């Protein structure tokens, strides 16, 4: 019963394990947790695409070689987060945690997945230059030291005008500012202002309506979202989750039925039945903790607050 | 073989 090869890649860091033909999403997944040394995993699940091209994460529940993954070498993994906090700041406990978040979002702002005005851009790179260079210092750190570093989305390169040592001038007049501040708030502060940008934490997925006009349907942290195919920044109509009582599905199609039975029902139709599913199962995901983040902390989660408090407080 | 499939979300059920 030979072995599969898996390869399953942190943000920063690439793990090689060996699954079979009847090991678990949720055993591959306990185990990268373990191996990495996250907690708070909730947030989490290991990212894949299928063998007709779509990006999706894998379910736990059914068995790893039980589901489309494409058929390479090493089934290939990322260990990315799934599920996006309704505020950065008090839901993202651990060091770790709070980490894997920043270098995420970093990576898909430096990707233009998430899109970010230049002016915004430039702040965000010079906290990220704070967290990895410290405080800026003359001496050592002298004109162009950021010549070789990714910083800026490349929408604000190619779509502008000033060279790339400008653009180092201007990050680096930031950095100067955000002087005595430790990489852990640097990397924080980073995640705040991303977490308000049109784009940060949406999943968004190819869907028409029923005349057959191109649309996005986005499912984030708050509920759904109908976009405009030109507009994936601002919703032409969005579905809070208090104002659905019932979201279902039949092969291609989907409605969402409107809490308000004065109201009529919003129905968009899908590519493949696998989009459905997976619209359904992310739905799902974002609700289940959007309650119990309305609810009392769990004593696990308050000790890990509590625990959390004293590894930044002080001494004598 | 599996093609249906809903969540019920406001509902008075869940709160």
């Known amino acids: ?316 | 073989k599996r093609r249906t499939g809903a969540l019920t979300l406001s509902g008075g059920g869940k709160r």
Not at chain 1, 153 to 160: D, G, S, T
Not at chain 1, 251 to 263: E, S, T
């Open chain 1, 1 to 316: 019963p030979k072995p599969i090869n898996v390869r399953v890649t942190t943000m920063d860091a690439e793990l090689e394990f060996a699954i079979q033909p009847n090991t678990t999403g949720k055993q591959l997944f306990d185990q990268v947790v373990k191996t990495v040394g996250l907690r708070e995993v909730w947030f989490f699940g290991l990212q894949y695409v299928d063998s007709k091209g779509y990006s999706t994460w894998l379910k736990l529940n059914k068995k790893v070689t039980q589901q489309d993954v494409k058929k390479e070498n090493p089934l290939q993994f990322k260990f990315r987060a799934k599920f996006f906090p309704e505020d950065v700041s008090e839901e993202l406990i651990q060091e770790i945690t709070q980490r894997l978040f920043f270098l995420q979002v970093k990576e898909a702002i430096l990707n233009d997945e998430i899109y970010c005005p230049p002016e915004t851009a430039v702040l965000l790179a010079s906290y990220a230059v704070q967290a990895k260079y410290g405080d800026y210092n003359k001496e050592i750190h002298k004109p162009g030291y950021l010549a070789n570093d990714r910083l800026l989305p490349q929408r604000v390169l190619e779509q502008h005008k000033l060279t790339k040592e400008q653009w180092e001038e201007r990050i680096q007049n930031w950095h100067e500012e955000h002087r005595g501040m430790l990489r852990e708030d640097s990397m924080m502060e980073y995640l705040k202002i991303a977490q308000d940008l049109e784009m940060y934490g949406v999943n968004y997925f190819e869907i028409k309506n029923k005349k057959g006009t191109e649309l996005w349907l986005g499912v984030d942290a708050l509920g759904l979202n109908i976009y405009e195919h030109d507009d994936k920044l601002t919703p032409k109509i969005g579905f809070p989750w208090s104002e659905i009582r019932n979201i279902s599905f039949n092969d291609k199609k989907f409605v969402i039925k409107p809490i308000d039975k004065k109201a009529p029902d919003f129905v968009f139709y899908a590519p493949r039945l696998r989009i459905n599913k997976r619209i359904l199962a992310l739905c799902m995901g974002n609700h289940e903790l959007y309650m119990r983040r309305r609810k009392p902390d769990t004593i696990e989660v308050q000790q890990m607050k509590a625990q959390a408090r004293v590894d930044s407080s002080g001494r004598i």
